[PDB]
């Protein structure tokens, strides 16, 4: 029974995986796009 809850959690611990990435911007200003994309949500 512990086996599953090593299974469940460390499978569920995958589900909420949150990683960050830097996307460059060749034309638009990053400060605009940061206001626009944050006005949606």
């Amino acid at each position: 029974v512990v086996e599953r809850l090593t299974e469940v959690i460390q499978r569920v611990d995958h589900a909420g995986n949150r990683t960050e990435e830097v996307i460059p911007l060749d034309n638009a200003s990053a400060s605009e796009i940061a206001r626009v994309l944050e006005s949606l949500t």
Binding site: L25, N27, A28, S29, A30, S31, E32
Partner: protein, 49 residues
């Protein structure tokens, strides 16, 4: 000095305001032709008393 968006605007303005100017050669011509004349003819007398 501006953000990446405003810059790309101000580069297309400066590119279009940087054009080569033409120069002009302005001649004036001031002409004047004058022609005068006059004529004067008359007799006069005098005498004693």
């Amino acid at each position: 000095t501006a953000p990446q968006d405003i810059m790309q605007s101000l580069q297309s303005v400066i590119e279009q305001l940087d054009i080569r100017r033409a120069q002009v050669h302005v001649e004036a011509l001031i002409v004047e032709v004058a022609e005068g004349s006059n004529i004067n003819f008359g007799v006069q007398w005098a005498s004693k008393d």
